[PDB]
Design a binder for this molecule. Structure first.
Ligand SMILES: [Zn+2]
Lengths: 327, 533
């Protein structure tokens, strides 16, 4: 349709591309917009800076919220905190005054402002952590704080949660980029993988399959496969299952089972619990799709997961009891 | 015729190279004497003459008058001949100029004697004259009338294919398509190609990409050659027949050097006991070749890495030096396989067509696989050179693929099966399969891949005395080319509906396979996302 004015037609196209997982295509399309149209309206300029910071397009050069966020990210990447803090303060003031100038009267309008302020606060916490040095305990307490607040955001909309997850992913990628080779790099990589998998489930529960695939792509970009498969292979199988690729998901999960039952060796309780989860998922998938009679799938997967969980329950951890209950 | 055909072809060569009045007078005298003293002298070598002077109407008034005089002589004064009735009935129409009204009416009387030909009858007539003549240039008018017949009678192509559903492998439309393709391949390196290529392209443009429900292309061959090779029970006799036939075909060209070498080779083979035995056997068949030929009655020099691949826009030199190096060595034994040097030195196609024959001749007399090991190593080196990243011209690859195809059909002297026959040389067929993939020869590549997989399975079985992933990783480790990807590419480019899933389609995590499956299933929405991601 071309009857829609270009003031909002381009914004709708860009938003659709952002929600469709297309980043390089959006960047090239916006470059073509810059080529064909010289002047920039505030709306498309804001979308340009949003895609610039979201895609880590650092080559591209009052200010809007996305412009301030991109400037703060660049200042953090340049080890400049004075302009980083000034930009965040300006963004907070601009957002507060813009929110309070209107008539309000609607709770739903507060959610975008609260999400933007939360993103600014998280960037402030990251700047404080990255001010002088990074430690494993500080990274762990930051991640657990983020997970606890995301638990508080379970009932929130995905539209109001996606920018938070995107900013967290960008922050973790910056930390990985500017981390010297040591044991801290492995901890940051593990935290990044855990964040990406939680983003995968978060987007999966909202009937979205593009962002989870992008998260799995980043996981495969950083992490590498080995003899002992991690939990992100299982998350990849779940993503492919959500993508209606049942055959591929089943083949991947069966390969994971074949690797685990052949090279388990009781190496890790986390591997034991993800083996139980994989067996339970495989049994449920077989039961739902009915490619085999229940006689063999039940014995092969369900009782196997039950006995695996019950044979090593000497710790009585919550992460083990919930898995046993689910099995 | 022999002298009659030699003089008529020399005269038509002089006419086509543009004394023209003298040449027309001489050809009129020779055809008058042929039709006066004989009834079948012009039964075969007439269609060229007829179809050649038609474009000469747009010339000087003397040329036009002579052209019309000869045409009215041939279509009126010789239309009563019983033997020439079929020849005059089977020739291209002349819709060129209005001044040919007499020719048009006299042509349509015999052509439509039994009634008005339908579309199917027009197709059958076009195919009959297509195989009757080997010169596509003279068939331009036939292509034009075929185009008009298809355009005007588009309604008649529905019930023809409806009745052809029972036997789709003998489709008339696909037979015409391959016939036009063969004619274009014949006229790919001949004068006036821009007109014949346009005509055949327009003829194929008058018919859309109709699903013929067939995947294989069958190249129709004349029954005389097949029956002659069927009744030839000796490989020596078969080699003599194919060589003498090619010599006759290459004896009627405009170049004088090629025909001088051809006639010398004719006397060379016909003067030997092999030629005498050939004529003994050949003396029962009803072929005018008898009348045409009646008056005419070591390892040190082959080991060189540069000799096998001197391929920098030098395909002709490479084949010429290979044939010369093979013939000068002591491996060749047959007189016909030894005395062909002077003629093959100047003919490019002869080296290509005789290289498999000389290879088989040398390998027949090989002892202790002395030639077998050297040839296998050199051929494998050639294929590795082609697979190098080296930008070799496709004529060399298709030449070696033709050699491999011919050698695969040769029976092993020792007891064995077709599986042993396919391993005449010590080669691994995965590289040849990838070469055929680069040459768009998907069927040969798939067959070679199956042969290589069978060889690997047999080798593993005898070593012990093996899934597709295991074979793919083994090939990647040793050869460097993955069999699973090669098979996926073959099964994708071949167009078969459900063949990519067997190699890993829908069950492979690799993005390349996922993209191929997405494009195969027309799932463009997720395909674009995966391409960006
Ligand atoms: Zn090259």
């Amino acid at each position: 349709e071309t009857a829609i004015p270009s003031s909002t037609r381009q914004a709708g196209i860009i938003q659709a591309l952002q929600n469709l997982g297309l980043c390089h295509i959006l960047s090239v399309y916006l470059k073509g917009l810059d080529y064909e149209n010289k002047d920039w309206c505030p709306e498309l300029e804001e979308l340009h800076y949003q895609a610039a910071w979201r895609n880590m397009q650092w080559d591209h050069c009052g200010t809007s919220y996305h412009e301030s966020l991109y400037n703060a990210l660049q200042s953090l990447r340049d080890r400049e905190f004075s302009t980083f803090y000034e930009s965040l303060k300006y963004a907070r003031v601009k957002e507060v005054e813009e929110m309070c100038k209107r008539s309000l009267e609607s709770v739903y309008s507060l959610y975008p402002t609260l999400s933007r302020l939360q993103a600014i606060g998280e960037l402030e916490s990251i700047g404080e952590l990255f001010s002088r040095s990074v430690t494993h305990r500080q990274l762990s307490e930051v991640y657990i704080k983020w997970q606890k607040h995301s638990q508080l955001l379970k009932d929130s909309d995905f539209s109001f949660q996606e920018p938070i997850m995107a900013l967290r992913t960008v922050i973790l990628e910056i930390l990985m980029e500017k981390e010297m080779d040591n044991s801290q790099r492995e901890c940051i990589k593990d935290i990044l993988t855990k964040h990406l998998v939680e983003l995968s489930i978060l987007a999966r529960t909202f009937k979205n399959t593009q962002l989870p695939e992008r998260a799995i792509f980043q996981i495969k970009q950083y992490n590498s496969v080995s003899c002992g498969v991690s939990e992100w292979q299982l998350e990849e199988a779940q993503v492919f299952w959500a993508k209606k690729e049942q055959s591929l998901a089943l083949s991947i999960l069966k390969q994971m089972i074949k690797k685990l039952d052949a090279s388990c060796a009781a190496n890790n309780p986390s591997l034991k619990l993800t083996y139980t989860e994989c067996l339970r998922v495989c049994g449920n998938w077989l039961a739902e799709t009915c490619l085999e009679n229940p006689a063999v799938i039940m014995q092969t997967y369900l009782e196997k997961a039950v006995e695996v969980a019950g044979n090593y329950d000497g710790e009585s951890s919550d992460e083990l009891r919930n898995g046993k209950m689910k099995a | 015729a022999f002298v009659l055909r030699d003089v008529i072809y020399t005269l038509i060569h002089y006419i086509n190279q543009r004394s023209f009045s003298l040449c027309c007078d001489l050809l009129s005298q020779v055809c008058q004497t042929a039709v006066t003293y004989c009834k079948d002298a012009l039964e075969n070598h007439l269609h060229v003459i007829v179809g050649t002077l038609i474009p000469l109407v747009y010339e000087q008034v003397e040329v036009q008058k002579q052209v019309l005089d000869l045409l009215k002589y041939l279509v009126i004064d010789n239309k009563d001949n019983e033997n020439l009735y079929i020849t005059i009935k089977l020739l291209d129409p002349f819709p060129d100029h209005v001044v040919f009204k007499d020719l048009r009416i006299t042509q349509q009387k015999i052509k439509y004697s039994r009634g008005p030909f339908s579309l199917l009858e027009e197709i059958n007539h076009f195919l009959s004259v297509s195989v009757y003549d080997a010169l596509p240039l003279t068939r331009l008018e036939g292509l034009k009338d075929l185009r008009r017949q298809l355009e005007l009678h588009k309604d008649q192509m529905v019930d023809i294919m409806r009745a052809s559903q029972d036997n789709p492998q003998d489709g008339i439309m696909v037979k015409l398509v391959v016939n036009l393709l063969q004619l274009s391949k014949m006229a790919i390196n001949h004068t006036g190609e821009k007109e014949v290529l346009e005509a055949v392209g327009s003829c194929l443009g008058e018919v859309g990409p109709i699903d013929f429900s067939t995947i294989a292309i069958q190249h129709s061959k004349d029954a005389s050659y097949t029956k002659a090779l069927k009744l030839f029970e000796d490989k020596e006799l078969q080699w003599t027949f194919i060589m003498l036939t090619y010599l006759n075909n290459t004896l009627v060209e405009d170049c004088v050097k090629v025909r001088s070498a051809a006639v010398t080779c004719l006397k060379n083979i016909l003067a030997t006991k092999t030629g005498h035995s050939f004529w003994e056997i050949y003396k029962m068949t009803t072929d005018p070749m008898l009348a045409y030929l009646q008056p005419f009655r070591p390892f040190e020099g082959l080991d060189d890495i540069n000799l096998w691949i001197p391929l920098s826009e030098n395909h002709d030199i490479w084949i010429k030096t290979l044939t010369c190096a093979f013939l000068d060595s002591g491996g060749t034994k047959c007189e016909i396989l030894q005395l062909l040097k002077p003629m093959c030195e100047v003919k490019t196609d002869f080296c290509q067509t005789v290289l498999p024959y000389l290879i088989h001749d040398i390998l027949l007399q090989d002892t202790n696989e002395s030639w077998r090991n050297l040839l296998s190593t050199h051929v494998q080196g050639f294929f590795t050179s082609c697979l190098r990243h080296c930008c070799l011209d496709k004529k060399s690859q298709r030449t070696m693929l033709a050699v491999v195809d011919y050698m695969r059909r040769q029976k092993r002297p020792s007891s064995g099966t077709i599986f042993n026959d396919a391993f005449w040389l010590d080669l691994n067929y995965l590289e040849v399969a990838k070469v055929a993939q680069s040459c768009a020869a998907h069927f040969t590549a798939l067959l070679y891949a199956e042969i290589y997989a069978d060889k690997k399975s047999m080798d593993d079985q005898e070593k012990r005395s093996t899934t597709i992933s295991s074979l793919s990783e083994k090939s990647k480790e040793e050869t460097g080319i993955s069999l699973q990807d090669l098979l996926l590419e073959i099964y994708r480019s071949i167009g078969e509906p459900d063949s990519l899933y067997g190699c890993g389609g829908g069950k492979m995590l690799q993005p390349i396979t996922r993209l191929r499956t997405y494009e195969h299933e027309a799932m463009w929405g997720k395909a674009l996302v995966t391409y960006d991601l």
